[model samples]
Target: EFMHVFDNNGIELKAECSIGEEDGVYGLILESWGPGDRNKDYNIALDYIIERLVDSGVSQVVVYLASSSVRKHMHSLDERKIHPGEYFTLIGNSPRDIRLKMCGYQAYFSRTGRKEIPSGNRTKRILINVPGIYSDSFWASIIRG
Candidate 1:
């Protein structure tokens, strides 16, 4: 079963999944909506989620987002640019090194260029390819951002 979060324009969630232990850990995921809202920084979000993972005794998390509205608030200093997909990290920081190697990233682009004002008819969903699967490490990178 899944629980719904309705407090913000986004959804922050946790789920129960068993992984070779007597107990299960909560998998974290989030989705935000808006161009100006920054309920929490993406890095901070990652730190919090990871904390939840450690707290729940879970080792993994799956994050999902539906629109660009949430992308407006994310920025990364390492890449020296804003990563439209950094919102996945709003959970916790300090994840295991190997965990970062298996993280996943995907985004549906709304425009071909940042400056080009796309016409309504020109707007289409574009999927940005990421090189790895979603994993704890990938979630950690959000905090690294």
Candidate 2:
């Protein structure tokens, strides 16, 4: 059996895996940009992954990044599994970095004293982790009971 996944309303999310899915579950590398110019990119990547996974019967979709702020706009998908890591500088030195490192919440940035115009003066880079698991049911089931 095969299923096609597509949900624009965020009510029903799609799942998929890339090549070698039959070999086993694999991780996907995708990017999400900010303010609004990057959603199309995110959607394209997500859509492609979901299509592939639906065709191959993949388990889940893992979205990893160094920006937490982007996660706020995402309506659907699980947030607990989002993994944040330090992949760049400048925006990585803030309370988010401290909390992620000291609080042991799996941070994706570092506080290496590499300053960059300061937080208030420049745009901030928030950490966002949206891990989506491919399920046969609606997200309501998890929220209801």
Candidate 3:
């Protein structure tokens, strides 16, 4: 149901993911995605990541929120900065949109070994949350010498 990604310092993140389909469109939910080893830039490990999404066999992703101004003033258009317990969506097929947004994302499935999404009911739901924190996480930046 989940996978483990380890960093140079033995830091680990249980990357949780689930696939979904709605209106003939495919999507994925990446909940609580990292504790990544910023020290290494997570390069070698991503092949597996891409495999999971692409294998689903989805195609033709759509972009909503036309124009920069509309998307800018809202929440945070800057994908570079993200925090945990936050939710986000992405079109896994698009390399440009994802490569940077994920700080470096690239995944693809083989002739086998892939995520196969099944058709089902889908709808966005309203949810509520209260922020709280109890936190291994800030070693990479301070390690530079």
Candidate 4:
């Protein structure tokens, strides 16, 4: 299990990545949350997921932007030139270090309402490829933006 925390000024964001393997490929089961409908909240989630892939030496990851709201936020990140997949590389970093790096980043999450359910209840899964897996520090150079 892998986890990291980000402080969104006052909001608390928590993200967890669980490693899974299937057919010679690896999967990262990501679970994260914070106040909904906030761009900063989603950005933190995306950055954390990408950082996990880059830092854990995983070549692929699966995430469910299960809601239209979430997907829309991702599109916004792309528009802002902060493509999450672009952060993927073969670098490993300590969780503590990652946390420090995320100081400028921004999930308390409550389990209430339909959208709060786990991604397992979602309809689609997005698959991401980390094309470069050269070393433990390869990802450190790839900005999480």
Candidate 5:
């Protein structure tokens, strides 16, 4: 349910979360882009996508951003998120700081700032909230039709 809750605003998309897996290794392919149209969010910009990776119980992270411009704000966000003294900075974005201010880190995150980091086992307990691909603002907004 990675992208099941999201799609580009330009066009309405009905995202359906999917999984193809085996024991101990799950291949999670949540189509954040429904209708296969680019939201221009993470497809072109890593802003939104960066928020996702950390929210989903990620304890470790490694990212490869395609552009330097995108990395601009990421640099700001990452440094700000790590400070633990600036709630004003990290609290401004949606799905921003869900870590209770801990249990995460940035090995290499957004060159700019969508919160590049990792998670822990606690995310399973926090799953019902907004910490999941299955969870939307109203809960992973699947096809309403």
Candidate 6:
């Protein structure tokens, strides 16, 4: 849950949140850099995802966390009625935000201007209101085109 920026010169932490629809269920695909590390805070995009989902006028959402380690953090949510993890990777025309945001950053918006980056851990219960998990895969791909 803590965002750690290891001194990797060109590898600054980054995140991308996008929309997806499966079986008539509207959802979001949450991905980021430096995940699979317990010491780093990689969920900085959660707030933005929740905000966008709320604005889309969707009552419920199905989220995909995209990292096996990230799923452990949501054990609390998993205890609920949410479905179990699946060996799936999302592929489709999902809109995304590459304007990365960090957890402690004071910025309120991303370079894309498509998302509002909230400061600190202000992501609300909307994270728990949805269903999701951290699924894994090789040669990670982002469906933009």
Top of the candidates by lDDT: 4
Instruction: Note the Cα lDDT for every prediction shown.
Output: 0.30, 0.30, 0.28, 0.35, 0.30, 0.30
lDDT of 1 by residue, 31-73 (tens): 3322344333333343344554455445443332223432343
lDDT tens per residue, model 6, 42-92: 344443333343444433443332233333443333322222332111222
Error at 11, model 2, angstroms: 28
lDDT of 5 by residue, 26-136 (tens): 223223232345322322222233354434443332112223333345443234333334221223344434333322433233344444444322111011112223333
Off by over 4 Å in 1: 1-29, 68-93, 96-104, 107-145
- Candidate No. with top TM-score: 1
Q: When superposed on Cα atoms, how far off is each prediction in RMSD? A: 13.1, 14.0, 16.8, 12.3, 12.7, 13.4
lDDT of 4 by residue, 68-115 (tens): 344444443232211234442323555445433332211111122222
Q: Is candidate 3 or candidate 5 better by lDDT?
A: 5
- Number of backbone collisions per candidate: 20, 12, 3, 7, 15, 2
Prediction 3 global C-alpha lDDT: 0.28
Q: Which window of ten consecutive residues has the lowest lDDT sum in model 2?
A: 16-25
Candidate 4 Cα lDDT to native: 0.35
TM-scores, all candidates, are 0.29, 0.27, 0.24, 0.28, 0.23, 0.28
Give me candidate 1's TM-score against the actual structure.
Answer: 0.29
Poorly placed runs, candidate 3 (over 4 Å): 1-13, 21-25, 34-46, 52-145
Model 3, 1-145: lDDT tens digits are 6324443355553433333432222333333223353213232223233333234432222222212222244333222112122433335445335534443211111112212442221111101111121111211111110
TM-score of 6: 0.28
